[PDB]
Amino acid sequence: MGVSQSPRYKVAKRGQDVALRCDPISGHVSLFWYQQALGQGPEFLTYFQNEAQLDKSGLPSDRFFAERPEGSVSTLKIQRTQQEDSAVYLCASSLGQAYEQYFGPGTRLTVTEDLKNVFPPEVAVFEPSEAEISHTQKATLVCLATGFYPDHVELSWWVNGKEVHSGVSTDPQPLKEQPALNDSRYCLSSRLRVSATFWQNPRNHFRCQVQFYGLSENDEWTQDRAKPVTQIVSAEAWGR
């Protein structure tokens, strides 16, 4: 409980068929599949009514095909995925086609010609300036995640071993380092705002975490230098 999907982040090469899954809330008669791309609203795909598809209007290409044999678990597969498949596929469930919908985390998909384009984030943290401290009596830390592809990252701050959400302001979505080039890396920034009295404490430890989702184990890698797999990149600094 409630609606969960898997995987949440999946990067694949063109011509490589993939598969997604969704486990709706128990006791939900209906099930929906959507597609968000280019920032556009959820574009309908298919409809499941008690393990039975009663609507397939949203499906553009026949390469896609979802099945719900168990009646409580659905699986959408895409044979020979292409670039126009690079989007976020959502899943919804309800007591019926006449009730409100519950959405899951979704599945962010990104297809590429070569898997050599995958790269981990370059995380770095900066300290608050003396100007900001003496003026507002508050300190703001900056985290930067750069040179990472695709834009599959989850940034979070960790003060004294524990994650914080208060005063945390992160960018809505990663920005391409070079918007011109069709294939470009992404960047990201975040801001943690604490009191000047808090930052001026050496005891306090501040760390910026960036959960990156790359290639899994079942993916072969040739390049001799490292391997962009699902990893995390952080940067820390002590108070003054």
Binding site: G39, G41, F44, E100, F103, T170
Partner: protein, 100 residues
């Protein structure tokens, strides 16, 4: 902190000698998220209708509102009616609007 959609009165335009039925859904009181409040529509035959969103926009009074319009021939106004809009997050919805 409480999203609130609303189906506005339809409008009639012209494209290529065909009368065009254009509607829009406006969600209000939307937070300032890194994400957003997705907007999708539902028809009469149980099918959904692909639309065009304009994304959340920071209002001058320190708020956020996402917009999305929908276009379809006045011919099929006897199959999709009534019309329903959705938003959120779970998600939220509105009352059916008899096109006819």
């Amino acid at each position: 902190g409480t999203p609130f959609p609303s189906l506005a009165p339809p409008i009639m335009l012209l494209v290529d000698g065909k009368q065009q039925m254009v509607v829009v859904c406006l969600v209000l009181d939307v937070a300032p998220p890194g994400l957003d409040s997705p907007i999708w529509f539902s028809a009469g035959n149980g099918s959904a209708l692909d639309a065009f969103t304009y994304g959340p926009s920071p209002a001058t009074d320190g708020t956020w509102t996402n917009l999305a319009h929908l276009s379809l021939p006045s011919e099929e106004l006897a199959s999709w009616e009534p019309l329903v809009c959705h938003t959120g997050p779970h998600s939220r919805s509105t009352q059916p609007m008899h096109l006819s």
